[PDB]
Structures are given as C-alpha cells and as structure tokens.
C-alpha cells in the first residue's frame, strides 16, 4: 500500500509546521523511515560546521534566501540559494548552510547512507584555515543527531584549538 | 568542485524548456550523470503502462494537476497530484502517470538503480484486469528508454493479448 500516505499540499504543510523549524539546524523531516530523506529547513539557523556528506544533496529554496559556505579547492566559496533556485551538491563537498531569514524554507533531499558510509562534520581555523576538528558519524537522524555533536565541540577548548596556529575556534558564537 | 554547476532559478528553467517536455512520457532530466535523477514532467502525456520502480519516487506537482493510476492491493486506485502536492511513492507500487494539462510541471526525483536492480513496465487487461504483458529492464535513461519499449508493445498483437480472457489490449489508444 501507500506506506507514506497520500499526496498533500506542500505550502500548507510548511505553514503548519513553521513553528517547528528550530535552530541550530532549523530542520524538519517530512516522512519517516524512508530511503529518501526529505526535509524542510528554515531560518534563522546557527551553523559553524562544514558537513561532508558522502552522497548528493538536492536543494530547492522555496521561500526566502540562504547560502552555502563551501570549500571548493581549499578555497572558501559561497553558493547563494535565492528564492526559487535549485542546486544539486556533489558528494563530499564541504558545506556550511547559512539561513538568516525568518520564515525561510528550503526543500532538502538526501538518501539514507549505507552501513559504514559515514558523514563528516568539520570545523576550520578562522586565522589559518587549517582543519581544527573532524567527527565522523554513522548518521541515524539529520534532525536529532546534529546539535549534540556541535555541543561537545563548543563545550571544549581542546577540540577547538587549531593544531597549526593554536588559535581557539570561537565555537558557539563563530 | 561543483560538478553539477551552481544554483539556478527553477521557474525560469522550466519556462525555458517547456517546449521540450514532449509525449508519450513528457520527461526532461535536469542534471546528467548524477545519482539523483531529477526530472521535470509536463503534459499532455500518453501513458497506458504501469511502472514497477524498485526504488522510491518523490513527486512535487509545481504547475497544473495530474494523477497516478495505481494498483494498491489488486485494486485500481488513483492518487491525485493537485498543484502544490508532494508525494513519496513506495518501491514497487505500480503506477501509471496521467498528465492531461498543457503547461503542467511536476518535479520527479528517483535514484540511479544498482546493477541487477531492474525496472518493470506492465500492462493490465481492461476486461479481466489480469496482467497482459511485463518487460523488465536495466534502465539507463528514464527520458530515452521509455517510448521504444511502449512501441514494441503497441506494435504487436501477441504482446497485447490477455492470457486469461484473450482480449487484445488497445495499445496506443487505450
Ligand atoms: N544541508 C543541510 C544538512 O545536510 C543538514 C541540515 C541542514 C541543512 C541545510 O541545508 O540547512
Ligand atoms: N513517474 C514517472 C516515471 O517513473 C517515468 C516517467 C514519467 C513519470 C511521471 O510522473 O510522469
Ligand atoms: Fe548537509
Ligand atoms: Fe589556525
Ligand atoms: Fe515511474
Ligand atoms: Fe483479460
């Protein structure tokens, strides 16, 4: 049967769950236990991490504007997500979503990762740009696994200390 | 780098490629050679087949309305796709997309199938409902593998002959 239920109005669903799109991530999954992970992300969010997703991610900015901070070579870049843009992110491109606008909404689609395909979360030095800290995880929820991770980074000066220049990353106000 | 290029305006892309959304399928792939198969489908299309997709499919009806004829038990059903609806179709649910409206557009997202994960295309008897004909394929393009398949069904009375009641399926005007 229709395991994921019947079709429904998306604009109206987003209006109804707007109150639930909370920071740091601003996440919300539309269907549970499905192979496609379909989420709506709103603003304002708070992200200092770069995600290393080992699969592709699809974006469609439905309301408001946002941008992804990226590493493209070793260079800091930004891909803008103006209202109405779509974007397909290749695997492993480090990205840090910035969602400043209240009432913002972006459709974000990813797939369940196979066992032993791990996500990376990375922070980089503000001063020298060297990698400061990386955690790899077998992700089981993009909604409710993210903020505990950021938490233990923020709460610890040794994790935030650049191993190249010794600058201590600002953590939860970067 | 950004293999699939940078973000771009989706409404405008659809307007620009509207002339290309041709029947029977009405298909068009946004990015090539990617793991997510992201297509826009428009109308009017012409579909008599039921697709047995071994992975999930995501739908977001962006412009116009459409419906999927389904088999849910062994029962013929219809899930309507009114403008603005989203829908996640489970694996293997037989579906026949009907897109009657000109200037219609639906975002449809699927994944590349692994080797040896085959798609099924099926036709059913109008009179008795028995399965008339099934082809399994290792799909390599959802745009440009579909219509040749339908073609050899339509062009052949033995393929269209119900093995239960001997009724010959109407083929290319069903
Ligand atoms: N891209 C994202 C991710 O991988 C996890 C959570 C949120 C987002 C986003 O785009 O905001
Ligand atoms: N669902 C579809 C598919 O699997 C192939 C081609 C077209 C569609 C559609 O929704 O029209
Ligand atoms: Fe991400
Ligand atoms: Fe540093
Ligand atoms: Fe299909
Ligand atoms: Fe029959």
Swiss-Prot record, chains A, B:
Pathway: Cofactor biosynthesis; NAD(+) biosynthesis; quinolinate from L-kynurenine: step 3/3. It comes from the Bacteria. GO terms for biological process: anthranilate metabolic process; L-tryptophan catabolic process; NAD biosynthetic process; quinolinate biosynthetic process. Fe cation 1 binds at residues 51, 57, 95. Substrate binds at residues 57, 99, 110. Keywords: Dioxygenase, Iron, Metal-binding, Oxidoreductase, Plasmid, Pyridine nucleotide biosynthesis. Binds 2 Fe(2+) ions per subunit. It catalyses: 3-hydroxyanthranilate + O2 = (2Z,4Z)-2-amino-3-carboxymuconate 6-semialdehyde. Fe cation 2 binds at residues 125, 128, 162, 165. Changing residue 47 to A: Increases KM for 3-hydroxyanthranilate 7-fold. Decreases activity 1000-fold. Homodimer. This is 3-hydroxyanthranilate 3,4-dioxygenase. It comes from Cupriavidus metallidurans (strain ATCC 43123 / DSM 2839 / NBRC 102507 / CH34) (Ralstonia metallidurans). The lineage of its organism: Bacteria, Pseudomonadati, Pseudomonadota, Betaproteobacteria, Burkholderiales. The gene is nbaC.
